[PDB]
């Protein structure tokens, strides 16, 4: 029962509307351009005098170039500081955000430590002049909301500044503002009691939330605001309802609105009570003239937002400025009433407290300081593991498992689905042995454990899909042996354990020596779900005997590996006819164009090139400009020396450490430059051990130079500069990997020739090119960034390859096929291969796919075509077949001999009774290629894969929110 609860908004409501009604009786680029003005010239001051005259204050705000790098970070504030030392100048505001750039979620009290270091000299400043001019704390991003609250108090309690009036904005559309409010109210108390000032409290409906619905859909959060605009109505008056009292006189309140009703309330409330000294109304300057001069008559203090920018910045500010002002008389009086009534039971919990029912396993909220506070206790866990080195105990345990029997489809579901319930219950266990053992940050290690639980529960239903009704059937391998690397320590050998499980077969883990102790961890998630050493066997061999008699055991039936293409190569030779499906790195660009949003691009390639130091197949290596893309360089580079460097267990890094000290390969990378190239960051050995390194950025970097080719997966961006969006495609194109690859433009002509002229397995649009997440951006690649068949893991034919499929007799439905099919098809079978490449390509492989629907990022799953597949043998009806399918898919057929050569990366089909000469199998291993050398399926559904690349294309939707 709360006694802040009362009837007096019920009893003003008539004069309120009748107040409403009362003062308002008394393209769009333009009006802002007109309205920015300059920090530092004549205008601002002769606008101070002359509405000082006509009785308003302006709140004077700075805007500019996007703060992604301290150095810009400085530039707000140092600016702001030289405003509070103009003495016509009495209310400036300025945002956590533009004091400290790259605003660290995770570590809350750092960045609290942090701005309260930067931000002293300003109220310092304040404190100089008497009377004291006002310091507003804007908020924009529901992220700011706790940092910022904090940093006012802190700092407001402080000795010096224990007499200061300031103030802190609160968002009405957030519910859990509400909460806020009553926190600060009494804060206000417990500071009045000290001695202290007042504060102020400007209550704002909230501009963000376009941005909101973004960050909550990609994440699978709700919205942090309310769903309705009624809700926010509602909370703005509840609000404003609790803390015009006199039991509140300490906290003073803006109410910042041009809804006339939501001001008549606030005058009418303080005019009750008794209060009209708390309120001051703040407005937009220049946009009502007329209703802001009746206001004033009432309320007397009237505080005009005036937007103020340093002369480069000006273009800059005004676009920010058109976005907020766009974005935000009878059935308007009927919506307060509504308001009026609901005020009280509107929501006020936060509505990140719970999370939708979404199919992709939701990250941890860092805005949520529940979530905060278990990421200060996470553990460094040291499980026990042992080393196998004799080769007679892989031969024991591969036989053990061969001998359980296999479990139905309904039983591997079962399994998956508890598995993926617990990995999520030891989350933090994960998260713990991560960022010790592997050395990951939280916002890097998190999405990873999203990941392993994914796909569990994609690979389960996926399962269920291999009993489909349809012309084949699928007979699941017996055993498989997934050997991960150490940059992804959880997903990825889970993913593979995960995918064997579900077709059908038994799974040996052998993880990356660097990581034992993560495989660990996660194997306990498997047991408590019940997938026993019966079914997945974790196996610490080393890299002599005892590895190389695991990876070529007779009785392995496939090895799943991502890792360096040379290892690939490696285990294929002492077994050249195994079936190996891996992922093997890449050398992924960025092409960024004269029409792209430079600060945008800049957020996406510094994140793409940095995350988990460059230690990603996916990482973004180059970028590559087009022509001249201004502001983009600059604020790289600013963004770049802004990275905080530093161990992964400490939660203010961003970015973390190395696995281990650089190689041959990557040292030369960090250290050396190639002709012609200069450093625009130079890294830097930050520590002994050689782990913590600095970034760097390259500049110059030629086509077929050093850099171009090798990719050096560590902490190091190098820039081209092309002449034309076509030749930037041929550099994207021609660094003997396909695996990542992004633009950023928002012209569309140049994304629609990108998309069909780009050749990466995973294609980004105006976003970062890391982060793929299951089924939205199912994950591979091309060239030599795949080795096998090459089905993306988190796709639907991933798990389907884990195995070998057989046309079954089926009845094949009526479907037309166009006549140069038919005149090819002179078989039964080949009639029946005809008719199936059309269900088919009807059904699949010549749609377009966005499985998962999204608003803000459209995600399209799609098939192209293989350029050239070579045949070897000698059987004309079965050549015919691959004729049916290259008619349809275009690709070209070569026949192929033994000793005859065949690229890197080549398919090579099987056709005929003979077996395929061995010099060709040995051959393909030696340069990963693939060797198909199943039966030719008359069920186009498979066989059609053989002359198809799958290709996932994932585009940002939305202009800053509008879509
Ligand atoms: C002087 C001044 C200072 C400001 N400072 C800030 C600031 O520091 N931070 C900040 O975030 N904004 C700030 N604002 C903007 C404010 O938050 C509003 O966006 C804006 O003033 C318009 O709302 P309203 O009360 O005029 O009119 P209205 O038409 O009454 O209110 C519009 C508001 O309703 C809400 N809304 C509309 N549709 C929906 C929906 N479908 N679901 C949920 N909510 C919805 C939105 O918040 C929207 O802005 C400021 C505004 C002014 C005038
Ligand atoms: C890429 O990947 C590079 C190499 O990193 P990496 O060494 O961890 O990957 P890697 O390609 O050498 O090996 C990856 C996996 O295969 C295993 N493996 C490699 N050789 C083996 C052998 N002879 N016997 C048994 N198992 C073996 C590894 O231990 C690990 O589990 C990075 O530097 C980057 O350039």
Same mark, same amino acid.
């Given at each position: 029962?709360?006694?802040?609860?009362?009837?007096?908004?019920?009893?003003?409501?008539?004069?309120?509307?009748?107040?409403?009604?009362?003062?308002?009786?008394?393209?769009?680029?333009?009006?802002?351009?007109?309205?920015?003005?300059?920090?530092?010239?004549?205008?601002?001051?002769?606008?101070?005098?002359?509405?000082?005259?006509?009785?308003?204050?302006?709140?004077?705000?700075?805007?500019?170039?996007?703060?992604?790098?301290?150095?810009?970070?400085?530039?707000?504030?140092?600016?702001?500081?030289?405003?509070? %030392?103009?003495?016509?100048?009495?209310?400036?505001?300025?945002?956590?955000?533009?004091?400290?750039?790259?605003?660290?979620?995770?570590?809350?009290?750092?960045?609290?430590?942090?701005?309260?270091?930067? #931000?002293?000299?300003?109220?310092? #400043?304040?404190?100089?002049?008497?009377?004291?001019?006002?310091?507003?704390?804007?908020?924009?991003?529901?992220?700011?909301?706790?940092?910022?609250?904090?940093?006012?108090?802190?700092?407001?309690?402080?000795?010096?500044?224990?007499?200061?009036?300031?103030?802190?904005?609160?968002?009405?559309?957030?519910?859990?503002?509400?909460?806020?409010?009553?926190?600060?109210?009494?804060?206000?108390?417990?500071?009045?009691?000290?001695?202290?000032?007042?504060? %102020?409290?400007?209550?704002?409906?909230?501009?963000?939330?376009?941005?909101?619905?973004?960050?909550?859909?990609?994440?699978?959060?709700?919205?942090?605001?309310?769903?309705?605009?009624?809700?926010?109505?509602?909370?703005?008056?509840?609000?404003?309802?609790?803390?015009?009292?006199?039991?509140?006189?300490?906290?003073?309140?803006?109410?910042?609105?041009?809804?006339?009703?939501?001001?008549?309330?606030?005058?009418?409330?303080?005019?009750?009570?008794?209060?009209?000294?708390?309120?001051?109304?703040?407005?937009?300057?220049?946009?009502?003239?007329?209703?802001?001069?009746?206001?004033?008559?009432?309320?007397?203090?009237?505080?005009?937002?005036?937007?103020?920018?340093?002369?480069?910045?000006?273009?800059?500010?005004?676009?920010?400025?058109?976005?907020?002002?766009?974005?935000?008389?009878?059935?308007?009086?009927?919506?307060?009433?509504?308001?009026?009534?609901?005020?009280?039971?509107?929501?006020?919990?936060?509505?990140?407290?719970?999370?939708?029912?979404?199919?992709?396993?939701?990250?941890?909220?860092?805005?949520?300081?529940?979530?905060?506070?278990?990421?200060?206790?996470?553990?460094?866990?040291?499980?026990?593991?042992?080393?196998?080195?004799?080769?007679?105990?892989?031969? %024991?345990?591969?036989?053990?498992?061969?001998?359980?029997?296999?479990?139905?489809?309904?039983?591997?579901?079962?399994?998956?689905?508890?598995?993926?319930?617990?990995?999520?219950?030891?989350?933090?266990?994960?998260?713990?042995?991560?960022?010790?053992?592997?050395?990951?940050?939280?916002?890097?290690?998190?999405?990873?454990?999203?990941?392993?639980?994914?796909?569990?529960?994609?690979?389960?239903?996926?399962?269920?899909?291999?009993?489909?009704?349809?012309?084949?059937?699928?007979?699941?391998?017996?055993?498989?042996?997934?050997?991960?690397?150490?940059?992804?320590?959880?997903?990825?050998?889970?993913?593979?354990?995960?995918?064997?499980?579900?077709?059908?077969?038994?799974?040996?883990?052998?993880?990356?020596?660097?990581?034992?102790?993560?495989?660990?961890?996660?194997?306990?998630?498997?047991?408590?779900?019940?997938?026993?050493?019966?079914?997945?066997? #974790?196996?610490?061999?080393?890299?002599?005997?005892?590895?190389?008699?695991?990876?070529?055991?007779?009785?392995?039936?496939?090895?799943?590996?991502?890792?360096?293409?040379?290892?690939?190569?490696?285990?294929?030779?002492?077994?050249?006819?195994?079936?190996?499906?891996?992922?093997?790195?890449?050398?992924?660009?960025?092409?960024?164009?004269?029409?792209?949003?430079?600060?945008?691009?800049?957020?996406?390639?510094?994140?793409?090139?940095?995350?988990?130091?460059?230690?990603?197949?996916?990482?973004?290596?180059?970028?590559?400009?087009?022509?001249?893309?201004?502001?983009?360089?600059?604020?790289?580079?600013?963004?770049?020396?802004?990275?905080?460097?530093?161990?992964?267990?400490?939660?203010?890094?961003?970015?973390?450490?190395?696995?281990?000290?650089?190689?041959?390969?990557?040292?030369?990378?960090?250290?050396?430059?190639?002709?012609?190239?200069?450093?625009?960051?130079?890294?830097?050995?930050?520590?002994?051990?050689?782990?913590?390194?600095?970034?760097?950025?390259?500049?110059?970097?030629?086509?077929?130079?050093?850099?171009?080719?090798?990719?050096?997966?560590?902490?190091?961006?190098?820039?081209?500069?092309?002449?034309?969006?076509?030749?930037?495609?041929?550099?994207?194109?021609?660094?003997?990997?396909?695996?990542?690859?992004?633009?950023?433009?928002?012209?569309?002509?140049?994304?629609?020739?990108?998309?069909?002229?780009?050749?990466?397995?995973?294609?980004?649009?105006?976003?970062?090119?890391?982060?793929?997440?299951?089924?939205?951006?199912?994950?591979?690649?091309?060239?030599?960034?795949?080795?096998?068949?090459?089905?993306?893991?988190?796709?639907?034919?991933?798990?389907?390859?884990?195995?070998?499929?057989?046309?079954?007799?089926?009845?094949?439905?009526?479907?037309?096929?166009?006549?140069?099919?038919?005149?090819?098809?002179?078989?039964?079978? #080949?009639?029946?291969?005809?008719?199936?490449?059309?269900?088919?390509?009807?059904?699949?492989?010549?749609?377009?796919?966005?499985?998962?629907?999204?608003?803000?990022?459209?995600?399209?799953?799609?098939?192209?075509?293989?350029?050239?597949?070579?045949?070897?043998?000698?059987?004309?009806?079965?050549?015919?077949?691959?004729?049916?399918?290259?008619?349809?898919?275009?690709?070209?057929?070569?026949?192929?001999?033994?000793?005859?050569?065949?690229?890197?990366?080549?398919?090579?089909?099987?056709?005929?009774?003979?077996?395929?000469?061995?010099?060709?199998?040995?051959?393909?291993?030696?340069?990963?290629?693939?060797?198909?050398?199943?039966?030719?399926?008359?069920?186009?559904?498979?066989?059609?894969?053989?002359?198809?690349?799958?290709?996932?294309?994932?585009?940002?939707?939305?202009?800053?929110?509008?879509?």
């Amino acid at each position: 029962l709360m006694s802040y609860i009362n009837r007096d908004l019920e009893n003003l409501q008539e004069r309120i509307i009748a107040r409403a009604n009362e003062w308002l009786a008394a393209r769009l680029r333009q009006m802002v351009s007109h309205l920015v003005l300059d920090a530092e010239g004549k205008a601002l001051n002769k606008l101070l005098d002359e509405s000082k005259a006509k009785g308003y204050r302006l709140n004077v705000n700075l805007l500019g170039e996007a703060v992604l790098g301290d150095g810009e970070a400085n530039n707000r504030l140092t600016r702001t500081m030289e405003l509070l %030392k103009n003495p016509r100048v009495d209310y400036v505001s300025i945002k956590a955000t533009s004091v400290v750039a790259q605003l660290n979620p995770w570590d809350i009290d750092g960045n609290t430590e942090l701005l309260k270091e930067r #931000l002293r000299p300003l109220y310092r #400043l304040a404190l100089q002049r008497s009377p004291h001019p006002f310091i507003n704390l804007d908020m924009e991003e529901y992220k700011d909301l706790h940092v910022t609250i904090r940093l006012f108090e802190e700092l407001l309690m402080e000795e010096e500044f224990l007499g200061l009036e300031a103030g802190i904005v609160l968002q009405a559309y957030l519910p859990d503002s509400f909460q806020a409010l009553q926190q600060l109210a009494d804060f206000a108390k417990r500071r009045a009691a000290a001695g202290g000032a007042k504060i %102020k409290i400007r209550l704002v409906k909230g501009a963000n939330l376009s941005m909101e619905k973004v960050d909550a859909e990609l994440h699978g959060w709700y919205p942090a605001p309310y769903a309705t605009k009624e809700e926010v109505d509602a909370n703005f008056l509840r609000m404003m309802d609790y803390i015009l009292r006199p039991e509140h006189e300490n906290v003073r309140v803006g109410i910042a609105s041009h809804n006339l009703f939501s001001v008549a309330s606030a005058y009418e409330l303080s005019v009750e009570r008794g209060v009209e000294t708390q309120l001051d109304v703040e407005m937009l300057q220049g946009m009502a003239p007329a209703q802001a001069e009746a206001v004033r008559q009432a309320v007397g203090t009237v505080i005009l937002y005036t937007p103020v920018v340093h002369a480069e910045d000006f273009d800059v500010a005004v676009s920010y400025l058109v976005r907020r002002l766009e974005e935000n008389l009878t059935e308007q009086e009927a919506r307060f009433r509504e308001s009026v009534a609901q005020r009280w039971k509107v929501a006020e919990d936060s509505r990140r407290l719970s999370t939708p029912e979404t199919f992709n396993a939701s990250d941890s909220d860092p805005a949520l300081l529940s979530t905060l506070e278990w990421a200060r206790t996470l553990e460094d866990p040291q499980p026990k593991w042992r080393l196998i080195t004799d080769v007679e105990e892989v031969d %024991k345990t591969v036989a053990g498992l061969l001998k359980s029997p296999r479990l139905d489809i309904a039983e591997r579901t079962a399994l998956l689905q508890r598995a993926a319930d617990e990995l999520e219950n030891i989350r933090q266990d994960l998260l713990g042995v991560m960022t010790h053992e592997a050395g990951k940050t939280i916002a890097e290690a998190d999405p990873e454990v999203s990941e392993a639980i994914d796909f569990a529960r994609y690979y389960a239903r996926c399962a269920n899909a291999l009993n489909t009704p349809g012309h084949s059937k699928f007979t699941p391998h017996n055993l498989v042996v997934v050997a991960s690397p150490w940059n992804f320590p959880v997903a990825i050998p889970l993913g593979g354990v995960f995918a064997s499980l579900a077709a059908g077969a038994k799974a040996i883990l052998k993880p990356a020596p660097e990581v034992r102790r993560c495989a660990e961890v996660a194997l306990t998630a498997l047991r408590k779900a019940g997938i026993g050493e019966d079914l997945v066997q #974790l196996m610490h061999t080393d890299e002599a005997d005892a590895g190389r008699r695991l990876m070529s055991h007779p009785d392995v039936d496939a090895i799943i590996l991502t890792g360096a293409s040379e290892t690939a190569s490696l285990f294929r030779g002492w077994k050249p006819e195994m079936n190996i499906h891996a992922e093997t790195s890449g050398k992924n660009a960025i092409i960024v164009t004269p029409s792209a949003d430079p600060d945008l691009a800049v957020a996406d390639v510094y994140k793409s090139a940095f995350g988990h130091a460059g230690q990603k197949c996916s990482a973004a290596s180059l970028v590559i400009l087009v022509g001249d893309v201004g502001r983009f360089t600059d604020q790289l580079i600013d963004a770049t020396r802004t990275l905080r460097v530093g161990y992964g267990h400490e939660l203010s890094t961003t970015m973390n450490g190395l696995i281990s000290p650089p190689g041959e390969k990557l040292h030369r990378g960090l250290t050396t430059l190639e002709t012609g190239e200069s450093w625009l960051v130079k890294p830097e050995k930050l520590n002994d051990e050689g782990t913590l390194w600095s970034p760097g950025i390259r500049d110059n970097v030629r086509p077929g130079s050093w850099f171009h080719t090798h990719e050096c997966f560590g902490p190091v961006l190098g820039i081209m500069h092309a002449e034309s969006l076509e030749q930037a495609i041929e550099w994207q194109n021609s660094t003997g990997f396909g695996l990542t690859g992004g633009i950023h433009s928002l012209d569309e002509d140049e994304v629609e020739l990108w998309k069909e002229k780009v050749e990466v397995g995973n294609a980004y649009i105006n976003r970062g090119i890391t982060g793929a997440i299951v089924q939205r951006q199912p994950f591979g690649g091309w060239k030599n960034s795949s080795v096998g068949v090459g089905a993306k893991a988190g796709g639907p034919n991933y798990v389907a390859q884990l195995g070998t499929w057989e046309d079954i007799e089926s009845d094949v439905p009526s479907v037309s096929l166009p006549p140069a099919y038919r005149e090819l098809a002179n078989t039964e079978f #080949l009639k029946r291969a005809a008719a199936l490449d059309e269900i088919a390509w009807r059904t699949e492989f010549g749609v377009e796919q966005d499985f998962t629907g999204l608003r803000c990022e459209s995600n399209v799953f799609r098939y192209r075509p293989l350029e050239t597949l070579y045949v070897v043998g000698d059987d004309e009806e079965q050549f015919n077949r691959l004729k049916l399918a290259a008619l349809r898919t275009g690709t070209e057929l070569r026949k192929l001999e033994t000793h005859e050569w065949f690229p890197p990366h080549s398919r090579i089909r099987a056709i005929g009774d003979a077996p395929v000469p061995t010099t060709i199998y040995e051959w393909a291993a030696l340069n990963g290629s693939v060797v198909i050398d199943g039966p030719v399926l008359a069920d186009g559904r498979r066989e059609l894969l053989h002359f198809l690349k799958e290709q996932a294309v994932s585009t940002t939707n939305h202009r800053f929110g509008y879509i």
